[PDB]
Amino acid sequence: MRECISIHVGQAGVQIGNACWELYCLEHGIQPDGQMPSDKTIGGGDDSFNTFFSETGAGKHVPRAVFVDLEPTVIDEVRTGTYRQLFHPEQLITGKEDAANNYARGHYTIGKEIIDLVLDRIRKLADQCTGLQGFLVFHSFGGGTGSGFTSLLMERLSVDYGKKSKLEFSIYPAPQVSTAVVEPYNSILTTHTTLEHSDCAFMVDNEAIYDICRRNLDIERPTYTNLNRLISQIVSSITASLRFDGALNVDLTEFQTNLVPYPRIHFPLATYAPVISAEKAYHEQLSVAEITNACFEPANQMVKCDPRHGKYMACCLLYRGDVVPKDVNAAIATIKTKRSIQFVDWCPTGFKVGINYQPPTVVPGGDLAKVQRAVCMLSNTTAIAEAWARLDHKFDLMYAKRAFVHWYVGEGMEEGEFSEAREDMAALEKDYEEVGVD
Amino acid sequence: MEVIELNKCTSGQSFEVILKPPSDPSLEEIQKKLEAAEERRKYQEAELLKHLAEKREHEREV
Amino acid sequence: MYTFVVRDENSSVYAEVSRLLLATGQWKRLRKDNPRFNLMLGERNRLPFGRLGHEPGLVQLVNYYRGADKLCRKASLVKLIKTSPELSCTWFPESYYLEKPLLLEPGHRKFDIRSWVLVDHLYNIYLYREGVLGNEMFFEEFNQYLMDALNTTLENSILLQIKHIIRSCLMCIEPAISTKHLHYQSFQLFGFDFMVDEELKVWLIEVNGAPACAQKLYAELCQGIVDVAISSVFPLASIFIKL
Amino acid sequence: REIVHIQAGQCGNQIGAKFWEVISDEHGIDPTGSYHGDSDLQLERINVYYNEAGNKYVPRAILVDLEPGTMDSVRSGPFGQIFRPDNFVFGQSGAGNNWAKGHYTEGAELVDSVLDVVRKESESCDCLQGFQLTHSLGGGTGSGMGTLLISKIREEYPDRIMNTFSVMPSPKVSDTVVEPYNATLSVHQLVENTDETYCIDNEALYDICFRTLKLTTPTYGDLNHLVSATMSGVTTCLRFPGQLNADLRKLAVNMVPFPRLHFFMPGFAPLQYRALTVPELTQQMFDSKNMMAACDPRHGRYLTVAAIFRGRMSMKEVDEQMLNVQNKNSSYFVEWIPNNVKTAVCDIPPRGLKMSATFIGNSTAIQELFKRISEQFTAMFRRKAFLHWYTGEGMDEMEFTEAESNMNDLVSEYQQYQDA
Ligand SMILES: Nc1nc2c(ncn2[C@@H]2O[C@H](COP(=O)(O)OP(=O)(O)OP(=O)(O)O)[C@@H](O)[C@H]2O)c(=O)[nH]1
Numbered sequence A: 001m002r003e004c005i006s007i008h009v010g011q012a013g014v015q016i017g018n019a020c021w022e023l024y025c026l027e028h029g030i031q032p033d034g035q036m037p038s039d040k041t042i043g044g045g046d047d048s049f050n051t052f053f054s055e056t057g058a059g060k061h062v063p064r065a066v067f068v069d070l071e072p073t074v075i076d077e078v079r080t081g082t083y084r085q086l087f088h089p090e091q092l093i094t095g096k097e098d099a100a101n102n103y104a105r106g107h108y109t110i111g112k113e114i115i116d117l118v119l120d121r122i123r124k125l126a127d128q129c130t131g132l133q134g135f136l137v138f139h140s141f142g143g144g145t146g147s148g149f150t151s152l153l154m155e156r157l158s159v160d161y162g163k164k165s166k167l168e169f170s171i172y173p174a175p176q177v178s179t180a181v182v183e184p185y186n187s188i189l190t191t192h193t194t195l196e197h198s199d200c201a202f203m204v205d206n207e208a209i210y211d212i213c214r215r216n217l218d219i220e221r222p223t224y225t226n227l228n229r230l231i232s233q234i235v236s237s238i239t240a241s242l243r244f245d246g247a248l249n250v251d252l253t254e255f256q257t258n259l260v261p262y263p264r265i266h267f268p269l270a271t272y273a274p275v276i277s278a279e280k281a282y283h284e285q286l287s288v289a290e291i292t293n294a295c296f297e298p299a300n301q302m303v304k305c306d307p308r309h310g311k312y313m314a315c316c317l318l319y320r321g322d323v324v325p326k327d328v329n330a331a332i333a334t335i336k337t338k339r340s341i342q343f344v345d346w347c348p349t350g351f352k353v354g355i356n357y358q359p360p361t362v363v364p365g366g367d368l369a370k371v372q373r374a375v376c377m378l379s380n381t382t383a384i385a386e387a388w389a390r391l392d393h394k395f396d397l398m399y400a401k402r403a404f405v406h407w408y409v410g411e412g413m414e415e416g417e418f419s420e421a422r423e424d425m426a427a428l429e430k431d432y433e434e435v436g437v438d
Numbered sequence B: 001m002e003v004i005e006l007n008k009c010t011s012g013q014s015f016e017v018i019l020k021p022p023s024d025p026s027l028e029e030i031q032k033k034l035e036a037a038e039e040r041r042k043y044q045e046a047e048l049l050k051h052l053a054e055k056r057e058h059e060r061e062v
Numbered sequence C: 001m002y003t004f005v006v007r008d009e010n011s012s013v014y015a016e017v018s019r020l021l022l023a024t025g026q027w028k029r030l031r032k033d034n035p036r037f038n039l040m041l042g043e044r045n046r047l048p049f050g051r052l053g054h055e056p057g058l059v060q061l062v063n064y065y066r067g068a069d070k071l072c073r074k075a076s077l078v079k080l081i082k083t084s085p086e087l088s089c090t091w092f093p094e095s096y097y098l099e100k101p102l103l104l105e106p107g108h109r110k111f112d113i114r115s116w117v118l119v120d121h122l123y124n125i126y127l128y129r130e131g132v133l134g135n136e137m138f139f140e141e142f143n144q145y146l147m148d149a150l151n152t153t154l155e156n157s158i159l160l161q162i163k164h165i166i167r168s169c170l171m172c173i174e175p176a177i178s179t180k181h182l183h184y185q186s187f188q189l190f191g192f193d194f195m196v197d198e199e200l201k202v203w204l205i206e207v208n209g210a211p212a213c214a215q216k217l218y219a220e221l222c223q224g225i226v227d228v229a230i231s232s233v234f235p236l237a238s239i240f241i242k243l
Numbered sequence D: 001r002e003i004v005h006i007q008a009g010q011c012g013n014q015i016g017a018k019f020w021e022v023i024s025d026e027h028g029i030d031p032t033g034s035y036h037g038d039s040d041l042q043l044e045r046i047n048v049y050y051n052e053a054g055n056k057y058v059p060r061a062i063l064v065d066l067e068p069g070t071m072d073s074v075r076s077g078p079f080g081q082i083f084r085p086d087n088f089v090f091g092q093s094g095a096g097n098n099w100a101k102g103h104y105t106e107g108a109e110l111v112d113s114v115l116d117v118v119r120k121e122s123e124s125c126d127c128l129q130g131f132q133l134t135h136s137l138g139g140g141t142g143s144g145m146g147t148l149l150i151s152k153i154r155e156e157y158p159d160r161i162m163n164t165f166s167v168m169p170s171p172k173v174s175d176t177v178v179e180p181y182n183a184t185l186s187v188h189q190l191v192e193n194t195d196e197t198y199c200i201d202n203e204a205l206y207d208i209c210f211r212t213l214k215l216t217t218p219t220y221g222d223l224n225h226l227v228s229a230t231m232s233g234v235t236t237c238l239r240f241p242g243q244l245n246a247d248l249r250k251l252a253v254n255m256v257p258f259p260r261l262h263f264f265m266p267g268f269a270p271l272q273y274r275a276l277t278v279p280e281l282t283q284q285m286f287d288s289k290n291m292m293a294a295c296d297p298r299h300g301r302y303l304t305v306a307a308i309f310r311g312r313m314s315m316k317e318v319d320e321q322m323l324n325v326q327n328k329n330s331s332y333f334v335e336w337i338p339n340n341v342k343t344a345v346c347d348i349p350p351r352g353l354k355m356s357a358t359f360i361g362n363s364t365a366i367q368e369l370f371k372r373i374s375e376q377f378t379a380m381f382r383r384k385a386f387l388h389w390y391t392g393e394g395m396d397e398m399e400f401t402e403a404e405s406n407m408n409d410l411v412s413e414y415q416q417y418q419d420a
């Protein structure tokens, strides 16, 4: 067995990490005090869940997690929340003042003063691992910590663990929840500086999940708790194969082998169905065919964009619940005749499927109804570039007048790092157009 | 439409269905850049204390 | 009061749509690059479809269908017909000259037919009643000729085949360009060009994604656009047949 | 995240006193410093403005004047004994409505004593955000000495945020003719040494009281009542917990795209037993009648805007009305700062209202105000009139030509972005 370390950086990273580890505990049966009745090997193991948990002599099951915020208010609620007994105090790390929505303040100024401590607390977990596979990093593109400190942590992790895999879960900025006018700036900076250091990154656009919470959960004004509980379902599907017995995506090297033929093009689109309200009085349960079909509807993707006008490089179906292979291939056969699904020439049109018979778990009293079968699709479409174009264009609008640049320079950045980061993004858009169009 | 590499176990199954086949910077360099930025700060801060010292002298002269 | 921008300044048809829209007193035009718009009359090329539909509280509509170029670029159209099962077809010339066309008399004169087709956001297909053959012959005239000279009508000899060819091309690409469940919506005006042969058989030549009209019609048809494609989506305070 | 409050001069201390009365009633503090509220939202961020005592609460407030009159009035007023007595710092001779006496002579003699109270308040701050100053620009103490303090504080605390509520003079409601001199000198200081300045024009305050509140002879107290409501609303997000951590540096980062264009137009609604509907708040908030700087926002373009709704209302309706007004007035927001209008909401309303809205705008129409000041200045300075009051305190004409020049530059910079 091989261990995985999760790193949660910033407000978005931490709060989403709350929702995930809560969901994990509910799924592996681990109660808030760290106990896991169904674990009979007291105080040790190399079961599949042990990829995400270590064990104490007292039988406590401990997340292989590191939480990091430049300011303490958020990681404090974890220190005093329902799962306090879950974490070792030294896994929760906080500073004094935050990056004030400023990449450079998170990367250069305030980041440089806490990086070595964070690497030290992470080392303390790598030494508890017989064969560590790598890291899963949760952060926003838009916050100053989320973008600037993360890109600095990602630079040093490549140095200290050159042989390890690094996956990202990245909250892409949406105006109807956003925090700062400068998030497009932070977004491009931290992409430019983290690209070479990441193997695979899953972009969750806050706009997509926000509309899903409204359209499909009939929530007028969705909260971070709503957003984050839905995001935790999608991450749980993506990570189920690291924590459970199976043969698809069993280690972090398989995510990039199975989903990333090109190193730079390592942003797979995620689609999830079904999202059903807990207060839907009458609900007809959907079928294998109906939920596999919903995987090709843009209104279900973690990023809005039109996969019909791009090309596929890989497609991965991940089911949870009452699914057998035969219903899956009768669904695919139907869908293939009705939908435009074009792969790139140098790659095989087809699907990789994984099924876990346990149906999805829901936080008791949350907003998601329990379902008998659900699916998450991971596809590498060139269509996701639509989201880089949106973000690069907003960056071009402000930077053409140098709006807000002085906040970055005043922390030590040169103006050239902006145009360097934007020329890297302009190449990234050019790559996607290569693979994708004729 | 061919199925492949089918794997079973108590938790579920996995398989592959085909429809058609085909036709790092070093710690020293980080240090350097992380410190060329601090120098650029301290320079800017030093310009500030310089302009402020001039203002003290004008204050005295008036 | 709705909002719209103009990003193809020299398009005869939508120049007249913008003008008629203002005159309603219920639309104002913004500047090309202002994103807070209801309606985009967009560029002919590199139209940024990936930025539409991301403005909270704005229903957005654009006068082009992303993907329609598959039908409007000759090389693509040919690949389309040869390759798409929904097309096999018997009305498109062998492609990789029609040496026996129909001739109007007196003059032994050749001609081609331009038909105007509006596809709204629901994917309804609207054929404009007025087609065109200033070296311009319209439908009332052409009909009478056919009756007098051939003892048939325009509907029976030519229009059945035309409505059939329009249906078949646009229902072919429907699942690839439809905006039914998208986050922005599309309509688009098309121009189809046909030729008729001595046997009274219709053929398809090209499909134009940015067609001009004919002067005396630039008015009935531009109003028909606001009525069916725009005000259908942005209500206010028939000249087409549906296919 | 502590904030050190400083109030200077006659206007600065009269408005500052009203401010501490208003928010003290909000946070449930009585004139004795004892909390007697019914909620803990009142106390969760109480430390941002108040220090703890018989655990009483005492404002983190320093009161500064060059004469004793106004501070005796504060100490004798409703919440007067709430203030820490060590924190009244004053001389005896006054500043004679004279910028130079405040900046160079009389104020120079007193400033170091103020900075000793500033230093005491700061050093015992867990994490100091910065400083907020209340003062007028048209007199001598708050203007001349106020900007002297701001220069000393930036030198000792160059990495904290500097924030002013700055009252701008006006011939309508006017103490002396030298106000345009005092104000031009002060705007030169403020453009360089603050991060955010709330521009409050006494002309607008008068018109609101006359043309809207239907007061035929407004006093300074009626004018300050408007300033108190706006100061309360402009700081709501700093003082109560919201889905956002609001602090002075995040406000500056998001409101100021160019470092010298940091002068904000405040607005308020409503300016009564029917609460307003969320549509009404939104209409009034953005109405020029409701704005406190006497600039027509339709004569410029908003670079950035921040709106705060107070009261229990439909957040959905709020967003719906914010999005409406932008898309009904997009000719007035710059298109090159995407998403430049932010919205906060707070459940606790202010005293006597169930629904209120506060507007903070960084519009290039503010240039009208600096042009008005510049015109009144050049009118006197071109005959060198009343200049001997300043040359007698040591100033040269040159420093005047320089501040006239730096503020005409400011007007050019604002005009540069109204047409970009
Ligand atoms: N989905 C989601 N998005 C969030 C959450 N918290 C913040 N965001 C988004 O993330 C962006 C801001 O980043 P934050 O995480 O708040 O920033 P941070 O890293 O704490 O940075 P500083 O506070 O600047 O130090 C905005 O787009 C927010 O909408 C969350 O819990 N869930």
Ligand SMILES: Nc1nc2c(ncn2[C@@H]2O[C@H](COP(=O)(O)OP(=O)(O)O)[C@@H](O)[C@H]2O)c(=O)[nH]1
Pocket: D008, D009, D010, D011, D012, D014, D015, D095, D096, D097, D098, D136, D137, D138, D139, D140, D141, D142, D143, D167, D168, D169, D170, D173, D174, D175, D179, D202, D205, D220, D223, D224
């Ligand atoms: N709004 C308001 N303005 C005032 C008040 N007192 C004075 N002013 C204005 O303040 C300016 C000069 O006053 P003052 O503050 O008294 O001078 P200082 O004591 O020398 O700082 C003038 O523009 C006055 O109109 C006040 O209480 N409220």
Ligand SMILES: O=C1c2ccccc2CCC[C@@H]1Cc1c[nH]c2cc(Cl)ccc12
Pocket: A179, A180, A181, D234, D235, D236, D237, D238, D244, D245, D246, D247, D248, D250, D251, D254, D255, D304, D305, D306, D307, D308, D339, D340, D341, D342, D343, D344
């Ligand atoms: O902290 C804040 C603050 C501080 C004091 C009073 C009122 C507020 C409003 C709430 C938000 C701001 C900060 C801010 C985050 N994103 C923004 C975008 C724009 Cl255009 C403008 C501002 C902000």
Ligand SMILES: [Ca+2]
Pocket: A039, A040, A041, A042, A043, A044, A045, A055
């Ligand atoms: Ca065990």
Ligand SMILES: [Ca+2]
Pocket: D093, D106, D109
């Ligand atoms: Ca003296």
Ligand SMILES: [Mg+2]
Pocket: A010, A011, A069, A071, A098, A143, A145
């Ligand atoms: Mg934070």
Ligand SMILES: [Mg+2]
Pocket: C193, C205, C206
């Ligand atoms: Mg032709």
Ligand SMILES: [Mg+2]
Pocket: D010, D139, D175
């Ligand atoms: Mg006075």
